[PDB]
Symmetry: D2
């Protein structure tokens, strides 16, 4: 009845979104089990959550779980291209404030986040934060510090965001405790790796429809994202080469059957065109950045790439690729939304039949979400079940209600306990129809664990 506290592309997409949410719920048994387990107790009654994460169908199931458990929320996306407009519409049609659409400008992106922070032109009385990448966290600390006085905690989704939290902690500028949701095993080693395996080749196919088999790829980075991305491309038949600065991750790449190369001669990046391995890059049909670092696909690399190579980024921020250089020097031809040919023949105009161009996906933004739908529901199930458990834990601790001196001992960045990590994993396994074996009492004693777990020491790397 007259609900207007939202901003989306097209509200008439709600029915479509609701049909896909109903499907996603059946693909998300950990999250839906939390919804059924905690609905009666209402553990988030009184929670007012500021949320900033890609407004996908999967985020929708997260949002409605939080609400089902008693929370009120205000939501935005954490990327200008990652929203699914039918998902945003369905959330708005349910009476939940949401400000998100695919294809936002940077100005519109900032406006959307501020519409969650401000209700009727004044600070909302928020008391919790859910974030993916740290942009909302940064705005609260820099622009709305007084609002953090009443906030009990932050649950942070992704590697880059965790890094920004830890910098604030070391510098003494973090105002509230956080849970690092990224480093649950059912998050980092599920979402970060297997998610990109599913969705990297997905986005490249939808953007270009290029055959990948038999072609040459260079993947920059071999962390969790680089591992899944490399697998995404190798399993399609690409000849994949991997770059790394971390020798242990490079050792893994070698043992996984990849050739380890550097874009720079002897791996020495002195900033000149001369240090580029021109012969290597002139053979590369596809380069993918996965690092969370800055300028790992730089201007000289872009100048040396094989004609018509595809360039994309699947790390959190677009500065992994020197796109600024390309805007300033080369002419952009839009093929379709989030697909651009970049003509290296000059800046003023281009020949429509020019052969010397590069194809950039999503303007260098997260490519799995920009050109496809990101990770699949059954994978995000694990990530968003951790999110819900982390919101419950920090809300229940009530950090904001301690005295100055009690906050001081509680101000940290923590992960969830392994027992809960395992309980999330068990529901995911059951979702596949898997059957976990149960230790006998003598077997539990033999290896020194409790029959119900946890089954590994906190040092275990899986």
């Amino acid at each position: 009845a007259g609900f207007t506290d939202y901003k989306v592309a097209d509200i008439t997409l709600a029915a479509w979104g609701r049909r896909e949410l109903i499907i996603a719920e059946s693909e998300m048994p950990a999250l839906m089990g939390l919804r059924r387990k905690y609905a009666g107790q209402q553990p988030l009654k009184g929670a007012k959550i500021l949320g900033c994460i890609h407004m996908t169908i999967q985020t929708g199931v997260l949002i409605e779980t939080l609400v089902a458990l008693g929370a009120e929320v205000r939501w935005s996306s954490c990327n200008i291209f990652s929203t699914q407009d039918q998902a945003a519409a369905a959330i708005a049609a349910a009476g939940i404030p949401v400000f998100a659409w695919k294809g936002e400008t940077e100005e519109e992106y900032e406006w959307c986040i501020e519409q969650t922070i401000l209700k009727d032109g004044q600070p909302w009385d928020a008391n919790m934060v859910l974030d993916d990448g740290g942009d909302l966290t940064e705005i609260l600390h820099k622009k709305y510090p007084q609002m953090l006085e009443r906030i009990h905690g932050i649950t942070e989704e992704t590697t880059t965001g965790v890094h920004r939290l830890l910098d604030m902690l070391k510098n003494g500028t973090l105002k509230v405790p956080a849970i690092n949701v990224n480093d649950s095993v059912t998050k980092s080693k599920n979402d970060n790796k297997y998610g990109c395996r599913h969705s990297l080749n997905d986005a490249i196919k939808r953007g270009t429809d290029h055959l990948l088999s038999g072609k040459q790829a260079l993947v920059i980075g071999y962390g969790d994202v680089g591992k899944g991305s490399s697998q995404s491309l190798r399993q399609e038949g690409m000849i994949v080469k991997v770059a790394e600065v971390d020798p242990i991750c490079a050792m893994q790449a070698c043992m996984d059957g990849f050739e380890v190369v550097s874009p720079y001669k002897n791996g020495i990046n002195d900033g000149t065109e001369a240090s580029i391995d021109a012969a290597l890059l002139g053979k590369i049909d596809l380069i993918v950045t996965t690092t969370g670092n800055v300028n790992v696909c730089d201007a000289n690399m872009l100048k040396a790439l094989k004609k018509r190579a595809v360039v994309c980024n699947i790390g959190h921020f677009d500065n992994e690729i020197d796109t600024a250089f390309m805007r300033k020097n080369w002419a952009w031809e839009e093929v379709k939304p989030q697909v651009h040919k970049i003509h290296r023949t000059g800046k003023d105009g281009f020949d429509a039949h020019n052969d010397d161009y590069l194809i950039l996906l999503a303007e260098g933004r997260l490519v799995n979400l920009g050109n496809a739908t990101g990770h699949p529901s059954r994978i995000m199930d694990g990530s968003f079940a951790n999110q819900v458990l982390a919101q419950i834990h920090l809300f229940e601790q009530k950090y904001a209600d301690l005295p100055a001196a009690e906050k001081a001992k509680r101000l940290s960045v923590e992960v969830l306990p392994k027992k809960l990590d395992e309980e999330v994993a068990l529901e995911m396994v059951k979702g596949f129809g898997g059957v976990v074996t149960q230790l006998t009492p003598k077997q539990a004693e033999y290896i020194g664990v409790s029959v119900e777990g946890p089954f590994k020491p906190d040092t275990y790397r899986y």
Copy 2:
């Protein structure tokens, strides 16, 4: 006139030396340490008791320790894992070694004793290198006085670490230890990729069975289980995985394996009624990888498909209830370390009976028992860590410290990540890989030194 050894055949020494020279070219991290530390002689004065599979790879480790100044006395940590040409060549170099392929249990104990004792009295050892904890246990239980002079233990494998931690928790650990297993250049190299190379290797040498198109069940999905599953799936087996750890089970699913339990609903009640007989009746090959007890039990063995292969790649053979098979069924040796177990009864067998199982290596570590274990280029990473761990604890001189200082240092620790990275770097250069160097701005951006360490200690890789 050197005679302080016992091996199968000293005339194999020339063959062993030829393979050691090749293996040196496959082990650049370990050999890089040998060249790096030869001048300093950091192990001069060290007297190391060593108990680890007497392979060609262990041979390269041994000579590196000696080149760095150590004296050693050596035995194998398994009755079937020795390569007799490796043993012969080490003995022919004047290094005390007591090991041969095919030891009895009695002979296995004698071999360890012969390193502990020299000329009838306890050797003046001051260091221990162990794989599985058998030597560590014999020292604590039968020779406690010798631990008064020992500076530490460097332990190779998951099971051995578990035994250390249990001793520490119980106040019975007498000296400090380094957990060599949990270096990333060990656990996530040796344990996983080593078994990937050597599991299917050992099954082929033992049976020459085709694997593509057949059904396997891998019990466990830790590091060894992950690598063993891959060893079989890459050959084209249809692989199912069992686990008690739901996180490891999650990894198996996402890796494309069906996760199942030998027991209905995963509940083992000790009766035949709880066995999933339909599942096991379809399994051509079962591999145990757990470090646990009786994970392929008698009821499972009674239910396996006729002619299935049974093997264990965990450290100890009690993963399989072989004792039950010895008591109730008739064993027919096909050839060394390959037996048909005839389920028709105890007293003799029909040579053309079709109701048998094939057991490899009598349930002992099958990659080392029926083949040669992990390849040189993989063991390179494990044994470089071993050398760095021996240097660190020998230089700490725990045995000489006053009691209060001992109490500060009586623990089980891992090597620093910086050293893990330097090992990995030489491994990568061995493949011809080129690591990229961060620029100052890039190192500042992610908050690391250009030289590393590149990850926090929490990182799981």
Copy 3:
């Protein structure tokens, strides 16, 4: 003032052209034919009726035929396979095209007729290019007099070749045909690797389902079934395979798949009792690849696991008993070409019902229906064969022969291996591959010319 077409939206032409320019750079064999033959205009005077999926790739084929001198009039061979931006770009270039995504059956027939008729009278066509045989059937059945002026037919796909051979068997085929399907650079490229690329693509676009760790059933293991199985296995699915051909089933076993039948003892007696209910109750995804009829039947659909995905990648939708589902179950459209089928009955459904199946493209070709079919660099091979096939038959002028000569010339043949190899070499070069040249001595050693053909006609690759 060009109006001789009908497409969804002419304003999509500019986008269509941008994707065509990219496709040209992905199709070197095809574009190579443009350059080699353009000066000689071998298709001058050719008037080609074309019926094949109106994709971007088909657009490059069309413009190659035109660049070599032909006139054409085109329709799609499937109601869902058209890319509307490709048909718009062809129309805007002045070429008669009648095709859009989401045709009805009536509209499908109307579109084909618009190519046969120009200004209400039969077009003066003298060549036919077909994919599935629908246009060929209509000509033989409804416009026989037109075949008196046609020099031949070039047929793209296995199902259409079968229908040509039935006519040749019966003596009702009026003009000769080239079987384009059985070129190696078609069958073992398009049929296999094409579905490998585009099956998991279409399933992801339609459902966004995770595939890793779930159970799939692929009916059939010919070229399409081989590629489809790989499309799913490489994603981490556990794939089971059904076959009626023991040789193809043997290959599935060796490729690492479990071969199963939907029916007990493999006997399909048409009763529920025949269905392996435990098997069907485990299956998350079933894909039909056979070119046969009712290989995913009513009893199988009734037994499928709740929320299973059902799709067909064979040419015709009768592989799946969708008529049963239309008559008995209620259909809920998720989005275009994605329907939930509620097994609770016909009279409505509960929006939160859990007992449903997901059908893609209403049982039509799923790679073209829910995605964009094969990628350009694969269709390069297929369509370079098409072009050469068209020249081959057109230059032979069957229609100008007397009846006695036609009888000797009537046939269904494949292109000579030499042309097959020439196409293949251009495909290899597009990957940057370098083929090695035989020395004279080596050529003589194996009994071939340095220029090929390199294999006898019996070779299977």
Copy 4:
């Protein structure tokens, strides 16, 4: 006792060979199915078969199937390194003439074949031939042409052998008809491909125990043997490159995810050191030849290969590699049997710690049989069921007893009917527990086949 008509390395190995034969019988259901189906009718009663094929355990089961169906045989191996001494001992212990052992010289190889041809110093009354590679066939035509007057046919196992038969037929020199067993689908696309997949990495591990993951391989050829060999290495994690002269096979290698390269610049082999791609070969850790051609790993390639590379051949004959050049110029150091280090520092003497060497396996002979045990029983089941069917067919045809005008009509090289190819496959599939579905009558009519098969036209390539 009394029986002395054989020559093997060590007769005391018979009991061990018998045990492995009993195991292999359970791995070979197609072959043991033929044994049980035809034992009663004794279709080979009166046949006297000269056999020349690798004296492995799998060949033992073939030999005893022929005898069980009524034949007498005299047997030798078709390679100096491929015999399993325990299989040879078991056959001799069963009273079957066999002349074979591992590690024959070239002279002993010729002697062994001659011992099958001659019994008691005069030609045996042979009337059938089973061959693998055509050596025995060539000796009969050249040195014992009168014996062919009594012989009803030849069943030839392998690609090279079939090639030699077709050239004799084209020249009018083939004296008896033959069955090309190689080109059954249950042979060529099972044995030649999947057999090398199983046995190539097997042999390299037994010989060197080298890690293969992360290393660079060059496979020369991509026919059936090259396809299986490339997969054998790739599945281990090797970075595999493929060379071919046939562009269709090259196209398959690209689509299968391999980079297609040539050892020669632009693929032009002009016999000069300048034509070698030294940068490419200086990066190769392992080269495998699979072609059935001559000198495809030549002297100039050998000179350019990375130090300590492994060199082996899995084609039928050793002249795929220029071992003669290596014998003439470099010093060979035997590591152990069938494993030699080839020191490129000179011909006379070597430094025991020299680093500039190559590792050659099996002296360039068939490496899977030389350094391991060849194909596994369950694969050879297909090959050898075809051999039994082919022997029965040609023996029952009785070519040597036909009138001249009938002889002329039947003097050819043929394959078995597709119906028998399918029947062999069915028993293989059942051996895995596979279940083949039966067409309904309607379905059979729809695709134009009989419910019983054959299911494909003879043009079908699978």
